[PDB]
Amino acid sequence: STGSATTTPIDSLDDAYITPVQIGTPAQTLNLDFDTGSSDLWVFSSETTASEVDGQTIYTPSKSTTAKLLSGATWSISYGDGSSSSGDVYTDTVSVGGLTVTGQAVESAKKVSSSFTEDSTIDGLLGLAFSTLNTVSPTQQKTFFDNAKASLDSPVFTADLGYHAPGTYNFGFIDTTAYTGSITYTAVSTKQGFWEWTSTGYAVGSGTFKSTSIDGIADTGTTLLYLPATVVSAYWAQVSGAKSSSSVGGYVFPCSATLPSFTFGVGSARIVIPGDYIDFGPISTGSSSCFGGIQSSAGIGINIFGDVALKAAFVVFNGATTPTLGFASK
């Protein structure tokens, strides 16, 4: 089997991407944030505290003839941005772009933190990191990809995120028309539960490539590109007036700037992030100070190749016996 679904930016800055997901019988369609940095499929639901729902579409398991309460199971998750959610668990039929899993754990939110409530465009998350990170207790549950894998034509999914435009998530096949050149594959460590790999270096704009190993994760659920402070300083030093703002919480730059590109290494291959991809707009409405798309990972504890990086590439999440990651230009 295979599946293919369009993923769409939630707003004009690509702050996140949503992909429609069918849950239950009859289908209830929710727009989920596909997240290769976590491993829980959770949804706003009929069980979510009423005051914490503000415009999201909810899953109502009582209206699904295939929903079953997973007795005694609970979940609770906290993300790197300080947000969180928790609740109970059902199993139900879940389909993505024509690909169907029966008995998928659907984690129903009883509580969500304010940032989720305040974002009416995201109805939940669909985790695509390794199932070892799944938070369901006392019986850990598998991700959608883990459940589908054996049935897929090939044990892979691909992320092809757009810049200020829709893109595609495919399951079970590689669309050879969706990228240029070849796909360069690189080793993955699953030891921390992530799609963790090592970039071979970077360049800023038209500058020389610096060969240096940068360990990080391929994370579709993180908006920006988080790299070591040395690398980030080298990038922003090329932008007149850019500076790290303690009060804003990262590098900002004059909105009047044209940004340089940023290149990252994948083995001997090179992925070029155009400068415009690194502009995240005014820090507040009407401001001429703009938020940077490349930020320091110092204090995160890991480097994160988020959407800023991934959207410059066609990315293969290869779930073979020994997982790997593939990157191609597009």
Swiss-Prot record:
Cysteine disulfide partners in this protein: 255-290
Residues annotated as the enzyme's active site: 35, 199
MF-aspect GO terms: aspartic-type endopeptidase activity
Enzyme class: hydrolase
Catalyzed chemical reaction(s): Hydrolysis of proteins with specificity similar to that of pepsin A, prefers hydrophobic residues at P1 and P1', but does not cleave 14-Ala-|-Leu-15 in the B chain of insulin or Z-Glu-Tyr. Clots milk
GO biological process, alphabetically ordered: proteolysis
Its EC number(s): 3.4.23.22
UniProt domain Peptidase A1: residue ranges: 17-328
Alphabetical keyword list: Aspartyl protease, Disulfide bond, Hydrolase, Protease, Signal, Zymogen
Family: Belongs to the peptidase A1 family.
Protein name (database record): Endothiapepsin
